[PDB]
């Protein structure tokens, strides 16, 4: 088994649902996909349903 974790910085683009300014809820969606392989050689499955925040500040 291989267990690999590289750090990265991401700049996602998410639409701003600005109706109740200023207090409101922003819904930002970010996608992960393998640009090289489709579902013919690899298959992607999530380990845990929720993004872990053990290291969050």
């Amino acid at each position: 088994s291989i267990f690999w974790l590289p750090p990265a910085i991401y700049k996602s683009a998410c639409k701003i649902e600005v109706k109740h300014f200023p207090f409101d809820q922003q819904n930002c969606t970010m996608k992960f996909r393998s640009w090289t392989y489709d579902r013919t050689e690899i298959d992607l499955v999530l380990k845990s349903e929720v993004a872990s925040l053990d290291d969050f500040t």
Partner: antibody
Amino acid sequence: VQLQQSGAEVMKPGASVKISCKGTGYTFSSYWIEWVKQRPGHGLERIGEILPGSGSTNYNEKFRGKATFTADKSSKTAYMQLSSLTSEDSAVYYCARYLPYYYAMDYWGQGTSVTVSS
Amino acid sequence: DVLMTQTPLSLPVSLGDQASISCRSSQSIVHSNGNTYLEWYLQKPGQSPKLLIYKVSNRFSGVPDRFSGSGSGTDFTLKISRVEAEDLGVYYCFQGSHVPWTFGGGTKLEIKR
């Protein structure tokens, strides 16, 4: 997944009460944990939820200033400092996991009995 | 806070009869996304509450089909087809629209003879 709570707690009125919440089998520091107060007579009233990752806390407008939550990241444990206790708050306490706007409330605890008397 | 009104307070029904219970909110609890988020809880004497109906238009994974839920954008109704010896207990509503969240009033449900 599995939840653990503290044993029975008795104390003279006016002092503080600490109850512990342990969660295992999932990502403990990833989503909300909310507690519930059940008076032995009737009804269910909530007390509040916390996010064990950050310092995000909120309270119901009726139970403000009565309790203060706290969570640990090293050990998967949640505590609650309780303010001056009156004989109108002797009830059962539940804990549960919750994630807003999505799948939520799939498991519970076992129940913590707090019997305050002089 | 958006308060819940449960009707009736007690609906004694016989074994096998269909029972409907209404749960109304003081305000609109429909979210801007297009889904209404409400939870139904079933509590038995001396045990932790159980789950039967989350996301009313859907059903919980593990509960039999005898329970159903419906209603419009404001009025909600929980329906049971055949009440069994296990269905004794208390119902509870939980609205999931606005912050903070609150519970219902608690609907006592037993059998009748």
